[PDB]
Write a protein that binds this ligand. Structure first.
Ligand code: HEM
Ligand SMILES: CC[C@H]1OC(=O)[C@H](C)[C@@H](O)[C@H](C)[C@@H](O)[C@@H](C)C[C@@H](C)C(=O)[C@H](C)[C@@H](O)[C@H]1C
Length: 396
């Protein structure tokens, strides 16, 4: 049609396309053509609409498994995936692993997690300035945590990192490359679960194995694919967000300075930068209206698909004052960096904990921390549904 292509542009660093501000003011629900599937979808750019699309049972993610449905990513959605489940099947699927992810149990991890951080910043003072924060902190820290929590051997890091990168592909890989990797990841994760048949374990793969035999409502696909989801998300998010928050802090170095000063403002600064950063480069897993639903400016009809831009909802000038600006002293922060509704991030407390502990340590032990490579040459990941840096050389 004359419906525009979404994404609107190749992304630049952590910058928002300014069409998002235009769309927010004048056309906050707009028709867009997603890179894969057939047809058109409504793009949702404002906080109130995002909350309805993410929040209401009249929007179904399961309805989007149809290969004809528009989507951000080459492969048609895996039907046994958590994102493709609607409540109440979705609620039952999430109860299998949720206990592990409540703010209470995630708090219980802060000791082990801080020790791990210290050990790795130790190995980085040993190598000496300048060093690559990616090599020494951003990758090994979240990989260690999700490995211990799930029960995944650390010796498999290169294996699951390669699979995980492939499956967050936007334009870098083809549908058939990604379905291939998906099959391998399923068989590998099925393999690890099966090892707990006559040898149960006190870890989440432990729980996923007991479910295969003790639970009659959940298919083995769903249970095993859950293992894949936690292992992908459990390193892919935090690894990129550490590089992203650091990039935000050391470019306008006033922010890092201001945290060196008051290191107890780090929990608030993490929430503010979570609001400010497009971790999800563009759009979202799609929701299809199953009934007419009224958004701000339009009634989406049954069968019409919708896609949200999280980073755009988190720049809504009707919700956050001075949104175009990072403020660590904000009174309220009702951001949706972790989504909303049924599919609200399960790992949100873990990712909060890992971002909190990484930035605390750095601000406290490295007050001299600065970018020891040019901003113009920064190797931002290309052709993936998420943003982050491949390398971040820092001096102290
Ligand atoms: C800074 C860290 C993180 C951010 C910004 C983040 C962001 C998000 C967002 C926006 C969603 C919603 C997707 C949607 O509804 O379309 C989500 C879902 C999810 N996140 Fe996170 N996440 C983070 C950390 C983690 C961690 C540490 C894990 C696992 C250990 C994880 C696992 C998941 C899973 C499995 C889902 C899908 C949940 C469902 O479909 O019910 N995330 N995350
Ligand atoms: C369109 C962008 C989205 O990607 C997708 O839907 C991907 C195809 C999913 O299969 C990815 C690989 C799953 O592992 C998720 C469980 C990862 C978790 C972090 C998210 O939900 C994430 C926010 C995700 O929704 C977005 C990146």
């Amino acid at each position: 049609d004359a419906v525009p292509a979404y994404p609107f542009s190749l992304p630049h660093a952590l910058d928002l396309d300014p069409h998002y501000a235009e769309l927010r003011r004048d056309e906050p629900v707009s028709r867009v053509r997603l890179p894969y599937g057939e047809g058109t979808a409504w793009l949702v750019t404002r906080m109130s609409d995002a909350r309805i699309v993410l929040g209401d049972s009249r929007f179904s993610t399961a309805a989007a498994t149809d290969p004809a449905t528009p989507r951000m990513f080459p492969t048609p959605p895996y039907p046994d995936g958590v994102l493709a489940q609607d409540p109440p099947d979705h609620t039952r699927l999430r109860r299998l692993v949720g206990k592990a992810f409540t703010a209470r149990r995630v708090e219980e991890m802060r000791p082990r997690v801080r020790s791990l951080v210290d050990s790795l910043l130790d190995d980085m003072v040993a190598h000496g300035s300048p060093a690559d924060l990616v090599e020494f902190l951003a990758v090994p820290f979240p990989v260690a945590v999700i490995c211990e929590l799930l029960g995944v051997p650390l010796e498999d890091r290169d294996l699951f990192r390669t699979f995980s990168d492939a499956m967050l592909s936007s334009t870098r890989l083809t549908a058939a490359e990604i379905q291939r990797v998906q099959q391998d990841f399923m068989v590998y994760m099925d393999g690890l679960v099966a090892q707990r048949r006559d040898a149960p374990t006190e870890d989440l793969l432990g729980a996923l194995a007991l479910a295969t035999d003790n639970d009659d409502h959940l298919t083995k696909g769903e249970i095993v694919n859950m293992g894949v989801s936690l292992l992908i998300a459990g390193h892919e998010t935090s690894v990129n967000q550490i590089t992203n928050l650091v990039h935000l802090l050391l470019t306008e170095r006033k922010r890092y300075e201001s945290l060196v000063a008051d290191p107890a403002l780090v929990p608030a600064a993490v929430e503010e930068m979570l609001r400010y950063t497009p971790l999800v480069s563009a759009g979202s897993f799609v929701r299809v209206a199953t009934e007419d639903v009224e958004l701000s400016t339009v009634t989406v009809r049954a069968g019409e698909p919708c896609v949200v831009h999280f980073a755009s909802a988190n720049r809504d000038e009707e919700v956050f004052d001075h949104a175009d600006e990072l403020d660590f002293h904000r009174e309220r922060n009702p951001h949706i960096a972790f989504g909303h509704g049924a599919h609200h991030c399960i790992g949100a407390q873990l990712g909060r904990l890992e971002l909190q502990e990484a930035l605390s340590a750095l601000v406290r032990r490295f007050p001299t921390l600065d970018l020891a490579e040019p901003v113009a040459g920064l190797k931002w990941k290309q052709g993936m549904l998420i943003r982050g840096l491949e390398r971040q050389i820092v001096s102290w």
